Structures are given as structure tokens and as C-alpha cells.
Design an enzyme around this catalytic site. Structure first.
Site, PDB file in Angstrom:
ATOM      1  N   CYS B 157       8.832  24.033  20.055  1.00  0.00           N
ATOM      2  CA  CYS B 157       9.266  23.468  21.326  1.00  0.00           C
ATOM      3  C   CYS B 157       9.762  22.047  21.100  1.00  0.00           C
ATOM      4  CB  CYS B 157       8.144  23.479  22.371  1.00  0.00           C
ATOM      5  SG  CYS B 157       7.130  24.965  22.402  1.00  0.00           S
ATOM      6  N   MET B 365       4.331  22.428  28.225  1.00  0.00           N
ATOM      7  CA  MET B 365       5.334  22.439  27.174  1.00  0.00           C
ATOM      8  C   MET B 365       5.869  23.852  26.977  1.00  0.00           C
ATOM      9  SD  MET B 365       7.207  20.983  25.648  1.00  0.00           S
ATOM     10  CE  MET B 365       8.121  20.510  24.208  1.00  0.00           C
ATOM     11  N   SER B 369       2.477  25.606  26.491  1.00  0.00           N
ATOM     12  CA  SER B 369       1.881  24.607  25.619  1.00  0.00           C
ATOM     13  C   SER B 369       1.670  23.290  26.356  1.00  0.00           C
ATOM     14  CB  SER B 369       2.752  24.384  24.385  1.00  0.00           C
ATOM     15  OG  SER B 369       2.443  23.148  23.766  1.00  0.00           O
ATOM     16  N   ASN B 388       6.423  20.516  19.624  1.00  0.00           N
ATOM     17  CA  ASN B 388       5.491  21.393  18.938  1.00  0.00           C
ATOM     18  C   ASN B 388       6.070  21.802  17.589  1.00  0.00           C
ATOM     19  OD1 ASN B 388       3.534  23.365  18.223  1.00  0.00           O
ATOM     20  ND2 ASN B 388       3.127  23.744  20.396  1.00  0.00           N
ATOM     21  N   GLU B 529       3.065  37.688  24.765  1.00  0.00           N
ATOM     22  CA  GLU B 529       4.446  38.131  24.913  1.00  0.00           C
ATOM     23  C   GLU B 529       4.700  39.402  24.113  1.00  0.00           C
ATOM     24  OE1 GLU B 529       3.867  35.978  22.479  1.00  0.00           O
ATOM     25  OE2 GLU B 529       5.003  36.966  20.885  1.00  0.00           O
ATOM     26  N   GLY B 664       3.521  33.624  31.619  1.00  0.00           N
ATOM     27  CA  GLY B 664       4.120  32.332  31.932  1.00  0.00           C
ATOM     28  C   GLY B 664       5.505  32.392  32.521  1.00  0.00           C
TER      29      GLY B 664
END
Ligand SMILES: Nc1ncnc2c1ncn2[C@H]1C[C@H](O)[C@@H](COP(=O)(O)OP(=O)(O)OP(=O)(O)O)O1
Ligand SMILES: Nc1ncnc2c1ncn2[C@H]1C[C@H](O)[C@@H](COP(=O)(O)OP(=O)(O)OP(=O)(O)O)O1
Ligand SMILES: Nc1ncnc2c1ncn2[C@H]1C[C@H](O)[C@@H](COP(=O)(O)OP(=O)(O)OP(=O)(O)O)O1
Ligand SMILES: Nc1ncnc2c1ncn2[C@H]1C[C@H](O)[C@@H](COP(=O)(O)OP(=O)(O)OP(=O)(O)O)O1
Ligand SMILES: Cc1cn([C@H]2C[C@H](O)[C@@H](COP(=O)(O)OP(=O)(O)OP(=O)(O)O)O2)c(=O)[nH]c1=O
Ligand SMILES: Cc1cn([C@H]2C[C@H](O)[C@@H](COP(=O)(O)OP(=O)(O)OP(=O)(O)O)O2)c(=O)[nH]c1=O
Ligand SMILES: [Mg+2]
Ligand SMILES: [Mg+2]
Ligand SMILES: [Mg+2]
Ligand SMILES: [Zn+2]
Ligand SMILES: [Zn+2]
Lengths: 698, 699
Positions: B157, B365, B369, B388, B529, B664
Site C-alpha cells: 500500500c 490503509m 491496514s 505498507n 479475499e 472491506g
């Protein structure tokens, strides 16, 4: 019966079908005339059934199936059981052979490089054998193996933006209606171009951009008029509305121009897009053209860098804007200043192009063109067409291996033309395997004129000569120099020989087009990826040859020798014959000049002279800039690129060098070229006498 | 259509597809992924049959096309099982006179990206150290996103420092642009920056405090409009005019941001994962920016007013600013309430809870995150610009199963797996450190990471001194607790203490690793995911079907309450609030299920007010699915092959519109259907509030 043909993977051959039944049968039992009196009746039945149903053409897989049912029909099972087990076993063999799972640069570029390597590896095996051998040996050149035949890919297309922007469309995860402004229209234009560029391996063009952007300018005008009537007094309404509309138009222009120069595709490179205009009559179209020209003149960012893409393409029309009394002469002067300051745009001639091709349309792609076409309704349509694929011959190799004999040259020429025809047919058939769901932007949402469904076939957009296919060539000058030496432009015999070559190519293309119902047209290959492999793979086999191979490149198609420096008028007079003789599928002429920023009258004279003779012109001015010492002019070329001839500066961060490579321009510093292209660019010499330096430097 | 016997029957596209259903049936029961693929092959045959013939068609040549179409579409397994079955029947169908006998529906760039990812995964599996690679292959751990790393030194990220790098100008593509002089230009530059950044990385991205750094450009537009009004419009109206036009332009500056982000895609061929955060603005321009964002999300997407998927708007709640009815920004909170009720977005954050959990306040994030409080050498705290680095996931249920009810053995294998994960994490960080600024000039060279570096410099300057967060994943706390204390441990203090002790041990190990290696190691509740689509399947082969561990065919996502149970959200949040406090601060999100409450946002407001003090990040899911054939909106019945309208039974994505929250980021079923493992998670979800799950029935 003769009324039915056969399509391979050729005329119907009952013997060929009769051999399939026999050769399978001999796997288990010897041949004996005791049962052959039945198998002959078997082959006759499968022929009399094919004739009764299919009248136009038949594929090989349907020939195989139509036999299998008949074998079962005539109470036969011994050989049919063996018949299937080999046909099926072979079917997976060819598919498993063409299988991927058969195992200081941007990241996306590296990933695309690996993907292209894999695609080329699978496609080379996917190709038919003899054409693959010809391409490997260098007799012909397939184009862009990195994407085809691995995936169904169309070379380049003329996007029908009017069709989409009329009734809305869908892109990405969203669907949108028709725009109700001009900035929105330009944003959708850029987004649509970016989405299209990732679904094909070539360029794209927006023809008559002002003509189809005018109604949204009218909408902006109406909105601002209503706002003025609400807010401002009843005396300055028109002036305020016009000023706000003009500012919005120019703002939208800036946005689009910059948006194209930023977005990229999976390749990691800027799309090869281009724009065309010049047919505007009313006020809004004139303002749009002025905004485009001004935003190109201004520059690219705080350093006023030269824009590379999109490639603007102007239009010269007698009575519209050609003469000082014409109603759009100011637009022509602005275009002249733009051409002399930024090497763009290229001028198109309305009458010459409409006479050559059949109907005026912007050159879609690098330099490709389309002939006049009408649908069943009788209305001529230009935007919404496409080019399937391109392959290129090797004329200099045929000339060299002929050992100076013309008849042998013609014989090998016919052989190579047959090979190229087979290659083109295979490319067309491979492209026809696409599905709308493969690219909903192209085949499902009006990118090609029509909006089909997943239930329909893509061939509706290619048949009836709607879609063109180009067969390329290169090095007519080398071909003529093989038999008539370096200097032959003053000789009528060599010119007639080259014209006869082009005429034979055109005749073969016309015959193929009539046979296959696809517009097979000749093409001037831009040497995008041709000379780099061609020169080395020919000099390895033939060695160094005077004025034919020692140049380390190949003269592009039919243009004058770049090592010579004729006046532009002489060059155009010499070159005007080839497009007229049949080289109409794609062509573009170049003209070198010194810095004409303080003297744009010469370019105007050249454009006026070239209006009637040629139909496509391009300027080559030395507009390079070096910011470290404020130098403007040309750059001395070396094997490591270019450097400013005042300080030795060569890094791309503080230098600005663009050169015309293949129709389009390019910056060699930010993207080094192959050595053959570099040698070709370096060998270029100026055409009309003048100083190729504007500012000397610090 | 000509039958085998004869006569005439109508050509039905369903009859063609139903046979292919039985084709793949013999090899594998129908799955959501194979549903679109099977009908993808069914779409080629129907196109071809009408092309070749005009008046009449019989059966023994359509069977040839489908036999050919399967081969042409690389699906040999179905074809291999088709032809033998196909050839069997006709042979027996034959009757003597006396005695007889005795892959293509995907985008081009999508396929090319798939091939490139396969090549990269094959290279990376041999690029890895031995033990970590063996553990990943065996299902011991998961090395996230092997498709792009370690083949390329990617980055997970990136908090694009939009403020500074927008103010100072930057070079993108072949064009160098200066600071914007209008808000529309600023938002266009933001969209292109996001697209380029997503193309330069394998993970999500977000823009925090968008209003805070978008206010000056709105002020610039206001000043320009005031200057124009001083020359065009009269006096007493002047200032008023300068308002209205500006209020319009800001709206446009958001409208484009709603579409460009949705439209542009990376090399993968899918919309980039991106999110936006706001809510801290105080002056007029920031208020108008937030109102414009909420309004453009409310309005919808296109003529059908379809629900937007990306970007993920993320609201911020602050006590004394936009929480209480007396707050200056309560109207913005009410607008956010309505938008969240009708559109599943935005989520919420608590300023105090987040600032006490992770040192300072920052937008979450990427997907889930988080970062931690950090100050550079100059002492000025900086949040945007950090990034990240990488993620790997532990298999807690495997440890629980190998424990066989022995806690000490469980802890032994836990320590062993922690060591393996530490080795993996160190290798991933070391591989990423091998990158070069010239590899992605958008990120390392033009301010997207904060500092700007030249080509002749190392990337470690943007990672060391705990600047770049590095996270370790875990999943399945409920399963490991239920292995020991049964499937009803929610009321058992001992089991909760055991789970909290697991989290505390992970946090302490992360702290020790961060101290040793000078990179911020933080435990991170990974989103399932694709983990439960792979972790569960590999576990069920080695251990078989277990009682409420693997029979559900998925794994519970991190520390979340059991999905099968349906407790009221107050107790759910009370139970779940302990885990982030214990140390699971690297990334988290608390879900909350409601029925259709379009005409009742008061319940959502009460939940947000209750959860402000306890929970630091809440996301509300409410059924907003809608189909246009029968004009019904509400909830959908999760059939095996995706979803369908409960009234008319519609399924086609061109007419239906269903959105579901998938770890998410709310996904789009029927567009890119997920693996069957995740489809079971969505189907098993319940509603944590009594109420009707439908809004308006069909016709
Ligand atoms: N000219 C033809 N006329 C009628 N049928 C043909 C013709 N050519 C081939 N066929 C049919 C006969 C068989 O059923 C089937 C296979 O024949 P074949 O000559 O092997 O085609 P082919 O394209 O595979 O050539 P090859 O096998 O040499 O590559 O195709
Ligand atoms: N071993 C065999 N047993 C039974 N029939 C056979 C056998 N080999 C060939 N045939 C029949 C069926 C084939 O369609 C036909 C032509 O042979 P063949 O060319 O080898 O296969 P093919 O035409 O399907 O593809 P290709 O020729 O390119 O390998 O003759
Ligand atoms: N009426 C039809 N319309 C369209 N396709 C058909 C029709 N009948 C059969 N097919 C196609 C669909 C499949 O691809 C293939 C086999 O389907 P199948 O149902 O077994 O036909 P069938 O004639 O055997 O039906 P049944 O067994 O009930 O008599 O034939
Ligand atoms: N169990 C199976 N596994 C794989 N494919 C199957 C299976 N069953 C059927 N199919 C495929 C092949 C068949 O041709 C087609 C339709 O099934 P089926 O009706 O049983 O045969 P058929 O329709 O071709 O002849 P018939 O109507 O006389 O049964 O679907
Ligand atoms: C890429 C892109 C698409 N669109 C799409 C979204 C809509 O479906 C369509 C309509 O464009 P608009 O003209 O903006 O429609 P509007 O209702 O907002 O009218 P106004 O701006 O005057 O208030 O254009 C944008 O508006 N902006 C963009 O940047
Ligand atoms: C991609 C893109 C870049 N830019 C660039 C252009 C400039 O370099 C920078 C500043 O934006 P601009 O506002 O366009 O700068 P300007 O000097 O043209 O002033 P004005 O438009 O008010 O007349 O942003 C856009 O304006 N719009 C876009 O869509
Ligand atoms: Mg054959
Ligand atoms: Mg049947
Ligand atoms: Mg609008
Ligand atoms: Zn210099
Ligand atoms: Zn319905």
C-alpha cells in the site's frame, strides 16, 4: 457440385473425402474390392448431402462431422469407432501444443515484456508452417507477434466517437449517458481512447473532432446564456456568454491534451492516438480549432516541453481555408505557426485524398487509409472502421537474390505475393475468432459503428469490405538501385519499373479483395519494427553491398533517398506518382527544413504547391531545445543519441529532443531506438538551404 | 430445429446450455466461477449455429460445434468427458435391420495479466528460501500475492502524499505538470495519480483528509470567480454569485472523481482498490467538499443510478465537531447517515479511539491496514506518505487441529510457526529493499512517498527508522477457540482469555521483531479475499470434515463474532472491542448487519453513537440490491450459482444490480464472481437487527 466451395483450416474434391474413408479403414483390414463397392457409395452419399444443404462454403470441422453421421447411418461401426479416436486425439494435440501452461524500467513494462515473449512463443507455433518459415528466414515479416495470433487483435481503428457520445455507452464498471457539457465530452473522449488503446495493438484517431464536438459547445453556450440571464444585466449577456464558452472550450482542450499524454496501457507506453479537424464552418468549430492549435503551441508544463501525442492532423480545403481571402485563413496562419514551432500538425488535402481513396477521412493509425465505403442504406460512413492485420514483404531481398535478372525477380515476386496472401488470409481468419465479450468497448458499445450482442458474431463488422487489410512493403529505392545504380531518379526506365511493381501489387490486392470479400490494400510500412531486423538478417546472408546494405537501414517504401538533398518541390513532383499508381492504402511524404520560426512563408508556399499534387505532407524542423544553456535548433547525432552542440549535454531530464520516426514523433532520450532507426535518422539531410540554428547558446 | 426422428421444434438457447450443465456435472458440482465459464462456452455455440444456417438446423452438427467450441476454448476436461459420452449414445442409438452390434469471456489485458502472473508465480516459488516456500505450498502459511512478488520488488500500500506533491508539481507519463490553479484540475490530477500509483503496485491506496488539502484550490476558484464577477456582474449580487458558481464547480470536481477512479484500470484489468477519507474540515470550503462527495455518492452512477463500488469513502467522527446535535457539522453527519443507509458507504472512524489505539489519527490503509504514530527527524508528525511493505498469513486452525486439545503442544507449534513467519517477513522486506527509484518514478521519485530521491540513491531511506509498516496476518480465532472450548464459547471467560492471550503473544513477538529489525512489525487481521478459498480447502484434505471447523467450507475472518449466530450489535461490539485493544492494532474493521432501514436512519445513528467510544472502525451492511426487470429492491437469496431476484428470478448482470461487502471492499457479484469458498461466507450471513429485509416488491 461446382456450386459449393470448401474452406480450409481450394475446391471440393470427392477423391480427398474418399481417401479419408479408405485410409482409416486400412488400419485393421486389408483393402479388398469386395467392400469397396460400398465405401464408394458411402463417399457419394456424404457428397450428395453436403451439396443439398450448404451452397456458399464449408469449414473442415463440418466436413469431418458430416462424414461421421453418414458412417453411422450406413450400419457401419468397425471403422467409425477408429475414425473418432484419431480425429479427437489429434484435436487436443494441436491445442495442447498451443498452450501457455506448456512451460531500470517500469514494472508494468517488464510484466508486459514477459507476457509478449510468451505470446510470441505460442503464436509462432500457432502460425501455419510455411508462412512461419518465411517470417523466420526473413522473406516476409509478420507484424506484432507479441499480441497476435495469440489473442484476437485488431491493428488499428477509426473510433466512432459521435455514435457513443450521441446515446451514451458503458465503460469499466460504470455506464454513462450523453455528456451535457464540453469538458465532460473531452474527459469521456480521453477515457474512451485510453480504454480502446488497451484492446488493440495499434493507434487510433479522432476524425472531424470539431464537427462532432460542436453540439456540446452549443450546450455550454446555452447553459452560460441562462446563467447570464439569471445573474448579469440585459446588456452584456451575449459577450459574457461567449467569453465563458470560449474559456470553457480552451480549458477542456488543455485537459484532453494533457490527459492523453499521461494515461498508458498494459504496454506501459503512451497510446498512439491522433486527432484531425479543419472542416469547421460555424463559430463553435472555429473556436475549438483555435483552442486546439493554441494549446499545442503553448507547450507541455512549466518548461513548455514539446507535446508528442496525440498527433494533430490538419485539413486543407480549397474555398474553406486555402487562400488569403478564404473565410478561415486565420486558422491556417495559426496552424502554420504551430507547424513551424512544434513540427505539428500534418496537412491533409481534401480533393487529392477524396480522389485517391474515394472519400475524405483522417488517416487512421500511423499512416493507414481507407477507401470509400457505403452500407446497404447508401450513406457513406468513415468513422467506425478498422484494419485487421498487416504483413510486410521484403522487396530488397527479392531484388538482391535475382542476380540482376528481371524475369527471375518477377517469378520470386509472385511466389512471395502468394506466401503473403496465405499469411493475410490466416490473419483475417484468426481475427474473425474474436467475441464481443472479449472487448465490450470495441464490439459491444459502438466503437465500430454497430452495437452487437454476445449472441451475435463479430464478422458482421468486417464482411462486405467494411474492414480493410494492409499488405506492406519497403525499399523500392534499393530495388531500383539493384538494376540501375545509385542515381536513377533521372532515368525513366527505373521509375517505370518501380511504378510497374506498385501496379502489380495493386492488381494482386484487387484480385484478392474480390476473391475474399475483404478490402485487401497495399500499404507503406512505417518501419516501426521492420528495418531493425530486416537489414541485419539480410546482411548476414548477403553481406555488405554498396549503397544497398552498407547504410545499415532500408529506405522506407518509396520516398526519395534521404542521403540526397533535392528541393521539396522536386521531391514532391517525383513522389506524387506512387500514391496515384495504386499505393493508396497508406502513404505520407516528408519535407526537411531549417528553423523557419521567423519565416513561415516558405512552408505556406510548399503547402500551396503540394495541395494539388500530394494528399499528405509532414514537416521536419529542428525544434530541439537544451535548457541548460538555452539552446534552440538541431542536434548533432551520434551512436549514443544526441547532444547539444554547445555543452555536450545529453541527459533527458534537462534536454528536449523530438524527431519524426514513423509518422509520429518520438523522444530518443526518454526511449532509445534501435541502431538501424538511429542510423536512418542521422543520415537525414536538409532539403532547402538555411541555417539550422535559432539560438546559438550561452 | 430438426429432431433426430424429424418434425419441427423451436430453437431454445436454454436447451443448449442445459446439456453443458450436465457436462461439467460429472467432473465437479456447479460452482459460481464455473457458472459464468460454462455459459461463456454456451454463448459461442448459439452465435455460430445461426451464422452457418438460415432455414433449418438439426442436432448432429450443433453437437459438432459444442464439441469444437470446448476445444477452441481450452476446456479439454469438459470436452474429454463430453465426446466419450457423446459418442456412446449414438452407437447404441443405431439400430440394424435384423441384429445390431452383438477462458474466452475475459478481456485481452485480463488474459495477458493472467499469463504474466502465472510466470511471475512460477519464478517466485523458486526465488523463495526453502523452508518458507515449503510451508507456503503445504498450506502452513500464506505468502500473499505471489503473482507480483518477489518476482518484482513491489509495494503493498502507499499513502500518496497528495498535499505536498500536488503543491510542488510533478512529472507523470511524458508530461511534467505544475501546481493546479483550479479544483477540477486538482481532482483530474488526483485521479491520474491514483491510476498511475495503482499501476505501480500490487495493492490498494487511499487519500486521507481530502477536504483538508482540497480547500486551497476551492479558495483559488472562489477568488477567480470573484475577480470575474467584479468585471461582469453588478455590485450587490457580486459576492453571492461568487458563491453559487463555486458551489457548482466543487460538485463537478467531485463528480469527475466519482467516475474517473471508477473508469481507469491497471494492467490487471480491474478497477484499482482505492479509498477516500474526510470529515476533519471546519471552514466553508471543506464543508462544501464533504457535502459534494456525499451528494455525488447518493445520486448514483449513470442513468440507472447504479450503486458505486469504488472509491471507498470513509467518514470521520469527532466529538464536539460532527457528533452531537449541537455540533457545527451535524447536517453533514445526517447526510452521511442517509448515504450510508442507502449505499453501504461510507464507514466511520472514531477520532479518540483511533488516536489512542494507533498513536495518532489516520485513515485506514487500503483495504483494512493501519499505521502507527511516527515522527521524522525534524519532529513534525507525518501521516501521509508512508507505505505498507508486505503481508503473510498464519493458519491458526491448523495449529488448533494439530494441538488435539493440548494447549502446550499448541503453543509449541505456535512458536515454530512464528519463527517461520519471521523468516518469511525478513526475506520479503529484504527483497523489496532491492528496488530502485527508477523502477517506479511515480512512487520513489516524485513525492508520492513523502521525500523525493534521485536515481543514484537507495530506497531504504523511505523504509528504515520504522517508517514503512510491515504486517503479519492471522485468521480464525473463533475456530481455534471452538476446537478447545466448543462452538458456544462466547459466554465462557476462559476461552476469551485464551484468544486474547494468543493476540497478546502475537503482539509481543511483533514488538520484539520491530525492535530487532528497525521495521514496524504489527499483527494485522487479514481480509479473507482468497485465504478461506485456499486455507480451508487445503485443511479439509489433510484433516477431513470436522465438527464446526471445516464443514462450513470457510474460515471465520480473524476475530469477528461467529457469522452463523445473530446477536444484537451492542453485545457484538462489546465482545469484539477487546481484540484491537489487546494489540491487534495493525488492521481491523467491525461489520454490522441490518435489514432494510431506508426510512429509518435513527437506528444507525444510535449504533454509531454507541460505538464511537468503544469501537474505532465500523462498517454497516444493509441490503441495497435492486433489479430493474421487475423493479424490486431489498435483499437477495444466495443461490448456489450466485444470486437471483426473489420475485422474478432474474440473474443477468445487465439488468440486476447486487452489491455485497467482501472483506472491506464491497464487491460486484455476477461481474467477477468469487471463489466458492467466499460465496459460502456471504450466504451464511445473518441480520443483526429485527426488521424486514425487503423494501419494495416487484410487479
Ligand atoms: N479439397 C477438399 N475437398 C473436400 N474435402 C477435403 C478437401 N481437403 C480436405 N478435405 C477433408 C477430407 C477429410 O475429411 C479432411 C482431412 O483431409 P486433409 O487433406 O488431411 O486436410 P488437412 O487440412 O488436414 O491437410 P493435412 O492433413 O495434410 O494437413 O478434410
Ligand atoms: N489413425 C487413424 N485412424 C483412423 N482414421 C484416421 C487415422 N488417421 C487419419 N484418419 C482419418 C481421420 C482424419 O480426419 C483424416 C485425415 O488424417 P489426419 O490429417 O492425420 O488428421 P486431421 O486431418 O484431423 O489433422 P492433421 O492431418 O493436420 O493431422 O483421416
Ligand atoms: N429443441 C432444441 N433446441 C435447441 N437445441 C436443442 C434442441 N434439442 C436438442 N438440442 C441440443 C442441445 C444440446 O446441445 C444437444 C443435446 O440436448 P438433448 O436434450 O439431449 O436433445 P434431445 O433431442 O436428446 O432431447 P430429449 O433427450 O429430451 O429427446 O442438442
Ligand atoms: N453424465 C454426463 N457427463 C458429461 N456429459 C453429459 C452427461 N450426460 C449428458 N451429457 C452431455 C452429452 C449429451 O449428448 C448431452 C445430453 O445428454 P443426453 O440426453 O443423455 O444425451 P443425448 O441428448 O445426446 O441423447 P438422448 O436424448 O437420446 O439421451 O449432454
Ligand atoms: C469521465 C466523466 C463522465 N461523466 C458522465 C457522468 C454522467 O453520466 C454524464 C453526464 O455529464 P454531465 O454533463 O456532467 O451531467 P450533469 O447532470 O452533472 O449536468 P451538469 O454538469 O451541468 O450539472 O457524464 C461526468 O459527468 N464527468 C467525468 O469526468
Ligand atoms: C491532466 C490535466 C493537467 N492540467 C495541468 C495543466 C497545468 O499545467 C496545471 C495547472 O492547471 P491550469 O488551471 O489549467 O493552469 P492554467 O495556467 O492553464 O490556468 P487556467 O486554466 O485557469 O487558465 O494543471 C490541467 O489543467 N487539466 C488536466 O486535465
Ligand atoms: Mg489432415
Ligand atoms: Mg437428450
Ligand atoms: Mg456534471
Ligand atoms: Zn546546451
Ligand atoms: Zn426482480
Amino acid at each position: 457440385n461446382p456450386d459449393i466451395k470448401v474452406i480450409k483450416r481450394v475446391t471440393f474434391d470427392s477423391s480427398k473425402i474418399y481417401e479419408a474413408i479408405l485410409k482409416a479403414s486400412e488400419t485393421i483390414t486389408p483393402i479388398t474390392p469386395l467392400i469397396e463397392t460400398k465405401l464408394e457409395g458411402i463417399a457419394n452419399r456424404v457428397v450428395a448431402e453436403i451439396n443439398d444443404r450448404f451452397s456458399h462454403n464449408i469449414k473442415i470441422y463440418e466436413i469431418q462431422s458430416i462424414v461421421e453421421h453418414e458412417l453411422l447411418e450406413a450400419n457401419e461401426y468397425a471403422i467409425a469407432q477408429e475414425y473418432i479416436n484419431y480425429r479427437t486425439k489429434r484435436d487436443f494435440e494441436r491445442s495442447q501444443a498451443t498452450d501457455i501452461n506448456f512451460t531500470s524500467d517500469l514494472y508494468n513494462t517488464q510484466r508486459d515484456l514477459t507476457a509478449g515473449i510468451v505470446g510470441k512463443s505460442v503464436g509462432l507455433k500457432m502460425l501455419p508452417p510455411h508462412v512461419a518459415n518465411a517470417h523466420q528466414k526473413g522473406d516476409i515479416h509478420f507484424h506484432d507477434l507479441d499480441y497476435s495470433p495469440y489473442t484476437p487483435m485488431t491493428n488499428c481503428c477509426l473510433i466512432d466517437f459521435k455514435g457513443m457520445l450521441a446515446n451514451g455507452f458503458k465503460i469499466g464498471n460504470a455506464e454513462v449517458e450523453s455528456p451535457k457539457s464540453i469538458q465532460t465530452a473531452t474527459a469521456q473522449i480521453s477515457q474512451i481512447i485510453a480504454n480502446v488503446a488497451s484492446s488493440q495493438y495499434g493507434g487510433c484517431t479522432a476524425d472531424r473532432i470539431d464537427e462532432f464536438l460542436a453540439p456540446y459547445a452549443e450546450l455550454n453556450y446555452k447553459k452560460h446564456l441562462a446563467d447570464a440571464k439569471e445573474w448579469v444585466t440585459e446588456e452584456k449577456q451575449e459577450d459574457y456568454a461567449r467569453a465563458k464558452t470560449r474559456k470553457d472550450i480552451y480549458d477542456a482542450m488543455q485537459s484532453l491534451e494533457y490527459e492523453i499524454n499521461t494515461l498508458f496501457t498494459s504496454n506501459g507506453q503512451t497510446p498512439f492516438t491522433s486527432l484531425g479537424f479543419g472542416l469547421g464552418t460555424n463559430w463553435f468549430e472555429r473556436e475549438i480549432q483555435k483552442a486546439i492549435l493554441q494549446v499545442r503551441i503553448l507547450g507541455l508544463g512549466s518548461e513548455h516541453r514539446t507535446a508528442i501525442f496525440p498527433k494533430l492532423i490538419f485539413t486543407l480545403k480549397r474555398g474553406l481555408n486555402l487562400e488569403p481571402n478564404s473565410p478561415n485563413y486565420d486558422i491556417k496562419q495559426l496552424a502554420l505557426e504551430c507547424a513551424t514551432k512544434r513540427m505539428y500538425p500534418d496537412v491533409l488535402s481534401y480533393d487529392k485524398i477524396i480522389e485517391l481513396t474515394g472519400s475524405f477521412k483522417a488517416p487512421m493509425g500511423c499512416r493507414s487509409f481507407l477507401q470509400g465505403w457505403k452500407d446497404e442504406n447508401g450513406v457513406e460512413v468513415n468513422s467506425g472502421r478498422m484494419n485487421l492485420g498487416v504483413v510486410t514483404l521484403n522487396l530488397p531481398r527479392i531484388a538482391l537474390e535475382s542476380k540482376g535478372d528481371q524475369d527471375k525477380f518477377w517469378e520470386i515476386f509472385e511466389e512471395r505475393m502468394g506466401i503473403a496472401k496465405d499469411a493475410l488470409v490466416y490473419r483475417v481468419e484468426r481475427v474473425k475468432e474474436a467475441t464481443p465479450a472479449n472487448a465490450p468497448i470495441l464490439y459491444q458499445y459502438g466503437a465500430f459503428g454497430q452495437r452487437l450482442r454476445k449472441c451475435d458474431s463479430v464478422d458482421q463488422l468486417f464482411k462486405h469490405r467494411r474492414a480493410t487489410v494492409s499488405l506492406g512493403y519497403i525499399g523500392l529505392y534499393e530495388v531500383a538501385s539493384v538494376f540501375y545504380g545509385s542515381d536513377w531518379e533521372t532515368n525513366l526506365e527505373a521509375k517505370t519499373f518501380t511504378l510497374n511493381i506498385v501496379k502489380a501489387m495493386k492488381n494482386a490486392c484487387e484480385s484478392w479483395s474480390d476473391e475474399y470479400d475483404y478490402h485487401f490494400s497495399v500499404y507503406s510500412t512505417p518501419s516501426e519494427s521492420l528495418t531493425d531486423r530486416f537489414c541485419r538478417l539480410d546482411t548476414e546472408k548477403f553481406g555488405v553491398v554498396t549503397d544497398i546494405t552498407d547504410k545499415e537501414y532500408y529506405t522506407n517504401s518509396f520516398h526519395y533517398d534521404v542521403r540526397k538533398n533535392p528541393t521539396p518541390f522536386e521531391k514532391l513532383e517525383f513522389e506524387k506518382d506512387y500514391p496515384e499508381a495504386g499505393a493508396t492504402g497508406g502513404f505520407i511524404h516528408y519535407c526537411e527544413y531549417p528553423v523557419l520560426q521567423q519565416n513561415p512563408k516558405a512552408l505556406e508556399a510548399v503547402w500551396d504547391f503540394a495541395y494539388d499534387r500530394v494528399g499528405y505532407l509532414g514537416t521536419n524542423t529542428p525544434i530541439d531545445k537544451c535548457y541548460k544553456c538555452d539552446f534552440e535548433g538541431d542536434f548533432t547525432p551520434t551512436e549514443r543519441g544526441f547532444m547539444c552542440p554547445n555543452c555536450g549535454n545529453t541527459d533527458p531530464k534537462t534536454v528536449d529532443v523530438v524527431k519524426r520516426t514513423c509518422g509520429y514523433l518520438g523522444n530518443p532520450q526518454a526511449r532509445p531506438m534501435v541502431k538501424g532507426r538511429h542510423k536512418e535518422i542521422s543520415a537525414r539531410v536538409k532539403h532547402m538551404n538555411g541555417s539550422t540554428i535559432k539560438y546559438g547558446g550561452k
